[PDB]
Curated annotation (Swiss-Prot):
Binds 1 Mg(2+) ion per subunit. The chain holds residues 53 to 264 of 271 of the full protein. It is linked to Schizophrenia: A complex, multifactorial psychotic disorder or group of disorders characterized by disturbances in the form and content of thought (e.g. delusions, hallucinations), in mood (e.g. inappropriate affect), in sense of self and relationship to the external world (e.g. loss of ego boundaries, withdrawal), and in behavior (e.g bizarre or apparently purposeless behavior). Although it affects emotions, it is distinguished from mood disorders in which such disturbances are primary. The N-terminus is blocked. Belongs to the class I-like SAM-binding methyltransferase superfamily. Cation-dependent O-methyltransferase family. It catalyses: a catechol + S-adenosyl-L-methionine = a guaiacol + S-adenosyl-L-homocysteine + H(+); 2-hydroxyestrone + S-adenosyl-L-methionine = 2-hydroxy-3-methoxy-estrone + S-adenosyl-L-homocysteine + H(+); 4-hydroxyestrone + S-adenosyl-L-methionine = 4-methoxyestrone + S-adenosyl-L-homocysteine + H(+); 2-hydroxyestrone + S-adenosyl-L-methionine = 2-methoxyestrone + S-adenosyl-L-homocysteine + H(+). Brain, liver, placenta, lymphocytes and erythrocytes. This is Catechol O-methyltransferase. It is an enzyme of class 2 (transferase). GO terms for cellular component: axon; cytosol; dendrite; extracellular exosome; intracellular membrane-bounded organelle; membrane; plasma membrane; synapse.
Length: 212
C-alpha cells in the first residue's frame, strides 16, 4: 500500500466520477490534511488555468505525470479535439495517472507516454503524430528541465510562440534552466510568484515563450 495508492483510494471514494473539478479538490484536501505530495497544488494550478485559458493550446506536452493532478487540471480546460501527452518514467505513477484520468472522464484527450522523457522526445513526432507543441509543462526531475528543453528544440518540436511553463522555479529550484531561458534571446520570459503546494513557502511558475 503506497502513498500514491491511498490518494487514488481517496478520489475513488470522495470524488464524483466524470467531474474533473471534483477530483482536483479530493486530491488537494487529502494531501493538504493527511499526506504531502508533489502535485502542483491549487494555488499555482489557478495560474496554469489562467495561462491555458489564454493561450488555448491544441497540442500540449506534460513532463512527469505522477498521480495525474495536473493532467486533470490542464485537460479539463482543453477545447474539443485538443490533445495532451504526459510523459512519466515510473510505471507505478503511470498506472495511477491513468486510473485518475479515467475517473475524471478525461481519458479520451490525455495520452500517457510511459518512459524517460529523454528517450521518448525524439520519438514524439513519428510514433504519436506530432508536428509542433503549442505548450510544454515542465514538472519532472529538476535536473532535466534544461537538457529536455534543448532536446525539444533539437528535434524541432518547438515552434515560434510555443509556451514553456515551468514549475518549482524557486523551490526546489531549476537554476540552470532559469539561467538559460532568461538569458537566451530565443525565450521571452515572465515570472508568476506563487506558493509551494500545501505550504507557506514562496515558489512560482516561469513562463518561457520560444521565439525561434
Ligand atoms: C513533480 S512530480 C509530477 C507532478 C505532476 N505534474 C503534478 O503536478 O500533478 C515528478 C514526476 O515526474 C516523473 N519524472 C521524473 N523524471 C522524469 C523523466 N525524465 N521523464 C518522465 N518522467 C519523469 C517522476 O516519476 C515523478 O512522478
Ligand atoms: O519536494 N519538493 O519540494 C518538490 C515540489 C514540487 O512541486 C515538485 O514538482 C518536486 N519534484 O519535481 O520532485 C519536488
Ligand atoms: Mg512540481
Amino acid at each position: 500500500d503506497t502513498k500514491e495508492q491511498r490518494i487514488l483510494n481517496h478520489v475513488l471514494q470522495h470524488a464524483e466520477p466524470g467531474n474533473a473539478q471534483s477530483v482536483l479538490e479530493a486530491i488537494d484536501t487529502y494531501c493538504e490534511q493527511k499526506e504531502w505530495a508533489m502535485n502542483v497544488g491549487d494555488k499555482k494550478g489557478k495560474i496554469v488555468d489562467a495561462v491555458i485559458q489564454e493561450h488555448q493550446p491544441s497540442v500540449l506536452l506534460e513532463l512527469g505525470a505522477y498521480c495525474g493532478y495536473s493532467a486533470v487540471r490542464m485537460a479539463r480546460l482543453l477545447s474539443p479535439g485538443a490533445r495532451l501527452i504526459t510523459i512519466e518514467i515510473n510505471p507505478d505513477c503511470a498506472a495511477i495517472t491513468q486510473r485518475m484520468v479515467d475517473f475524471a472522464g478525461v481519458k479520451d484527450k490525455v495520452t500517457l507516454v510511459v518512459g524517460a522523457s529523454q528517450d521518448i522526445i525524439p520519438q514524439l513526432k513519428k510514433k504519436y503524430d506530432v508536428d509542433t507543441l503549442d505548450m510544454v509543462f515542465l514538472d519532472h526531475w529538476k535536473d532535466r528541465y534544461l537538457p529536455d528543453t534543448l532536446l525539444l528544440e533539437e528535434c524541432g518540436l518547438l515552434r515560434k510562440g510555443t509556451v514553456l511553463l515551468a514549475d518549482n522555479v524557486i523551490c526546489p529550484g531549476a537554476p540552470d534552466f532559469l539561467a538559460h531561458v532568461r538569458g537566451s534571446s530565443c525565450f521571452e520570459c515572465t515570472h508568476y510568484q506563487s506558493f509551494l503546494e500545501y505550504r507557506e513557502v514562496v515558489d512560482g511558475l516561469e513562463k518561457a515563450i520560444y521565439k525561434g
